[PDB]
Amino acid sequence: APAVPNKPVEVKGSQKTVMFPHAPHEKVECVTCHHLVDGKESYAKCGSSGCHDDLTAKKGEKSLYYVVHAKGELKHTSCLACHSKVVAEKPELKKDLTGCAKSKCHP
Ligand code: HEM
Ligand code: HEM
Ligand code: HEM
Ligand code: HEM
Secondary structure, eight states: OOOOOSSOEEEEOSSOEEEEOSGGGTTSOHHHHSOOBTTBOOOOOTTSTTSSOBSSOSSSTTBHHHHHHOOSOOSSOOHHHHHHHHHHHOGGGHHHHHOSSSSSSOO
8 A cells, every 4th residue: 555644634625625634543444434446445535536526516426525524324434424433432522523613624
């Protein structure tokens, strides 16, 4: 695999950009997020052409907003789905990991 980035990286939408840190996710398997595509591994950007390249729609497989924020029923784990399970076990982190304002994603 390539080396994991050692600094936070940009995740751009149509209007806002959020910084993603790999360090706190050191014990999550790479494949949980960089999922297989047509049975092969890939570390391309999520919003790459032919991937989740619709930067304005809020629903649908092709929407980057949806694959990031949807709370349930998906084929792979979204950022908000996993963070909601962590907050049930560590409720002190609710606003940092799930808030829409003043959180670690949208400070
Ligand atoms: C597991 C150790 C693992 C590896 C390896 C890895 C690599 C990696 C690379 C090479 C990039 C840069 C992509 C580029 O082409 O610029 C990258 C970026 C993102 N990653 Fe990652 N990553 C590993 C693990 C994880 C885990 C566990 C998750 C989810 C919690 C995750 C997520 C992301 C995200 C988001 C990005 C940014 C993509 C974008 O569209 O900007 N990585 N990773
Ligand atoms: C970048 C790390 C990235 C993320 C994040 C991500 C998430 C993701 C989710 C949550 C789903 C399920 C959506 C649903 O159930 O409606 C999902 C599904 C697909 N993905 Fe994805 N995805 C990331 C990376 C990439 C890349 C680099 C591509 C293009 C090669 C891509 C494509 C797809 C496709 C196609 C699907 C639908 C079928 C499936 O495998 O579930 N994703 N992704
Ligand atoms: C989806 C790409 C996604 C994002 C975005 C994301 C962000 C994120 C941040 C900003 C933090 C806080 C770290 C800090 O304050 O420096 C954080 C922390 C944790 N996350 Fe996350 N995360 C995304 C995805 C996922 C997934 C899919 C999981 C679970 C499979 C996950 C888990 C965690 C955990 C655990 C932490 C640390 C919590 C703690 O106990 O301190 N994240 N994430
Ligand atoms: C709380 C549920 C919450 C809301 C609501 C929210 C909104 C939001 C918007 C409107 C954007 C901009 C869309 C665009 O520019 O196209 C956006 C972008 C991102 N968000 Fe978000 N968001 C909420 C919560 C969180 C949390 C807790 C995290 C981190 C786990 C997070 C992450 C992201 C990421 C990544 C982006 C950029 C990619 C994209 O969705 O286009 N959000 N958010």
